[PDB]
Amino acid sequence: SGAIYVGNYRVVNRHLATHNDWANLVWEDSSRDLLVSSTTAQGCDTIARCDCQTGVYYCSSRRKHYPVSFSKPSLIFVEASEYYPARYQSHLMLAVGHSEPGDCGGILRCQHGVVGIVSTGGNGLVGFADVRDLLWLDE
């Protein structure tokens, strides 16, 4: 679980969006596993605008923040789960790190701010949904 709170926006994994989220929708993309809903109060997260490939992510299944190197946002095969059929997920970055289902929503941050949120994983892999291209989150 977890979200990004920037301006009057709440950014969550689309597969974990609550009933309150769909009733206040701004934008969603199934192929990216992202959903953005509107908020009444202003949030304080800053979105990174960079091409960093090193950062720190929060892993709820270990209660630890880990430093990682991560790939550039790409179209990557994601196996079928209870939330999506087998498909390519776009704008996804992989790192070598622990993750389990339950860790989705953990923030990945670099020196410039929020880069993305945990969205997928594997044996010793963790995947993050990038948000650095969503320039409109700033305005």
Ligand X SMILES: CSc1ccccc1N(C)C(=O)N1CCC[C@H](C(N)=O)C1
The catalytic site residues sit at: 15, 33, 104
Tallying the residues shown for the chain, one arrives at 139
Select the residue interacting with Zn ion from 17, 48, 68, 131 (CB under 5 A).
48
According to the binding rule CB under 6 A, does residue 51 interact with ligand X? no
**Minimum CB distance to ligand X smaller for 16 or for 52:** 16
**Minimum CB distance to Zn ion smaller for 105 or for 116:** 116
Q: Using CA atoms of 88, 57, 36, 17 in order, give the dihedral in degrees to the nearest 10.
A: 80
According to the binding rule CB under 6 A, does residue 33 interact with ligand X? yes
Residues 6+ apart with CB under 8 A from 75: 88, 89, 90, 92
Cβ burial, residue 33 (10 Å; 0-12/13-18/19+) = buried
Select the residue interacting with ligand X from 1, 71, 72, 100 (CB under 6 A).
100
Give bridge partners of residue 38 from the DSSP assignment: 9
CA–CA–CA angle 28, 72, 45 (5° rounding): 55
With contacts defined by CB under 6 A, name the span among 23-31, 34-42, 50-58, 114-122 that binds ligand X: 114-122
H or E segment at 21?
Answer: helix 19-22
Q: Minimum distance from CB of 137 to Zn ion (Å)?
A: 15
| Binding partner selected for residue 52 from ligand X, Zn ion, none, CB under the kind-specific 5 to 8 Å limit | Zn ion
Residues within the interface to ligand X (CB under 6 A)? 15, 33, 78, 81, 83-84, 89, 99-101, 103-104, 118-122
